[PDB]
Structures are given as structure tokens and as C-alpha cells.
Design a protein around this nucleic acid. Structure first.
Length: 234
RNA sequence: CGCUUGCUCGGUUCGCCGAGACUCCC
DNA sequence: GGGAGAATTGGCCA
DNA sequence: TGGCCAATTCT
């Protein structure tokens, strides 16, 4: 079993459902045809351009075997499900080996000390009571974590999109997925928490060693602003 | 042994701390 | 209600 | 030479 993972995107060149891989994978399900489907580029040429369905400058052998082969199983199986008892046009951009994520180019502990920060600076712990806390090696939420600023009738807060949210991109961990013209930068601290949650120690993890524990084929979601990874057999 | 993002739920001096899952998608 | 790889290889110009 | 982007593969 491959456990899942969930990471947040940061920036995109153009609107989500406007990349040409999506513009190719979208019409396939509507179309489904010849049936001349093969990994070989020659067979792929025949199935797509020749049969009739338009291609938006896409010819990758993997990028057309992860959407055509999926669609036929989408048009099938449900018939088998109709047989078993006796639809959505997914822009789920299934990334492949050739577009595997790599860390950004032109691990830190975070807050090294909990009860030690100069007074008045951001992150400073309160003075009315420093003791009476708990020390069981639980997760540490950073001061800017909006999970700690949620609104309720009993809660008091002054939410600002700059003070709270812009503080994230300062110490973010960028990784890049490139299909040739479209670039997506996701936040890897989700992967950090996912790997520390299952048992792996801290500090031995660096660049080129976090992504290794996850599968190299993400499933980007050009809606909800989220991406999803999977681990390996380990 | 060990824990930067997301989310659910509390009160608080408003500075911040206490508990929890991650098999998610159509 | 279905999917969540990446090893080996073949063209390959500075 | 070797180095990288695509192209081919089984279960």
C-alpha cells in the first residue's frame, strides 16, 4: 500500500485549467476512436491526430498513455459495474517520470526554542504563564499558522492577509514541477510533517532525501489549490 | 527517538497554549 | 465508483 | 565522450 500525502501549490503561470495537457485530456473523455492504442509513438499518432481528436502541441509518450489508457478504463469498468450489479471530466494532471519534482533553484528546525524569544518580537511566548504546558513531543504550530487563529464567538483576533499569510512564503520549501512551459511550485512542509508523522527521525532529512520517500508521480489538482503525493512501498 | 504548511475543536492577559486523523480523490 | 513507477534504453550534439 | 530528453516496459 502507498500512503497518500497532500501539499499546497503557490504560483502558476496561467489559470489552472488552461495548460495544454489539460486542454488535451479534457476532450478525450467526451470523445470516448479507431482503437489503435499503443505505447509506440506511431500508434499514438494514429489514435489521436489521424482519427480526428485535436492535440494541443502534445506528443509525450507518457503524457498520452496516462490519459488515453485511463479514459478507456473510465468508459469501461462502469459497464462492468453495470455487469457487476447484473463521468466527470477530470483535469487530474497525472504527472509522470519525465516531470518528477525537484527542489527549487534560482532541514531547519523552525523555531529552535519555544520558551525563549525576546519580548515583543513576533512569536514571543506569553508572560502571564510560561509553565503549565505539556512536553510530550507534540507537533509545534508556528505563530503564523492560521489553524491557531480560527474565528469563534469566544475567540478574539484581528485577521490580516499580509501579517498571517505572507509570513509563510518567507521560510517555505519550494519544489518545482515543469512540463516544459508550465511551472508549479508547491509547499513541501506538508511532506516534512508527513514524514515526521510516521516515525522517521529529524535532521538526517535534507534536500534530495525528502522527495525520495514519496513517489515521483504526483497527481496535481487544478482546483482546490492542492496537490497529492504517494509514498513508496516503505 | 523525534514534528515549519492544511484542517477539526477550546478558553485565554490577544502576546498564545492545550487535544486529533490522515486511504485522498473522482 | 477507478488510479496514484521508474528501470532500461535510444537518439544524441558541444 | 557523455549527457540529457524522450521513448519503451512489464506485472
Amino acid at each position: 500500500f502507498c500512503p497518500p500525502a497532500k501539499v499546497n501549490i503557490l504560483a502558476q503561470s496561467r489559470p489552472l485549467s488552461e495548460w495544454p495537457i489539460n486542454l488535451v485530456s479534457k476532450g478525450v473523455q467526451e470523445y470516448v476512436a479507431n482503437g489503435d492504442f499503443g505505447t509506440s509513438r506511431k500508434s499514438l499518432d494514429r489514435w489521436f491526430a489521424r482519427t480526428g481528436v485535436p492535440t494541443h502541441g502534445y506528443t509525450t509518450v507518457q503524457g498520452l498513455n496516462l490519459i488515453l489508457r485511463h479514459t478507456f478504463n473510465r468508459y469501461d469498468g462502469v459497464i462492468k459495474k453495470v455487469e457487476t450489479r447484473n463521468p466527470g471530466i477530470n483535469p487530474s494532471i497525472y504527472c509522470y517520470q519525465q516531470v518528477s519534482p525537484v527542489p527549487y533553484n534560482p532541514l531547519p528546525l523552525g523555531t529552535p526554542n519555544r520558551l525563549s524569544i525576546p519580548k515583543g518580537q513576533p512569536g514571543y511566548v506569553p508572560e502571564w504563564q510560561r509553565p503549565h504546558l505539556s512536553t510530550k513531543n507534540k507537533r509545534i504550530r508556528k505563530w503564523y499558522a492560521r489553524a491557531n487563529w480560527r474565528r469563534k464567538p469566544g475567540r478574539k483576533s484581528v485577521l490580516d492577509e499580509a501579517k498571517l499569510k505572507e509570513a509563510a512564503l518567507k521560510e517555505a520549501i519550494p519544489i518545482i514541477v515543469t512540463i516544459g512551459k508550465d511551472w508549479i511550485v508547491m509547499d513541501a512542509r506538508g511532506l516534512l510533517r508527513a514524514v515526521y508523522w510516521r516515525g522517521i527521525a529529524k535532521p538526517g532529512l535534507s534536500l534530495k532525501e525528502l522527495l525520495g520517500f514519496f513517489s515521483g508521480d504526483p497527481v496535481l489538482d487544478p482546483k482546490r489549490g492542492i496537490a497529492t503525493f504517494t509514498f513508496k512501498l516503505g
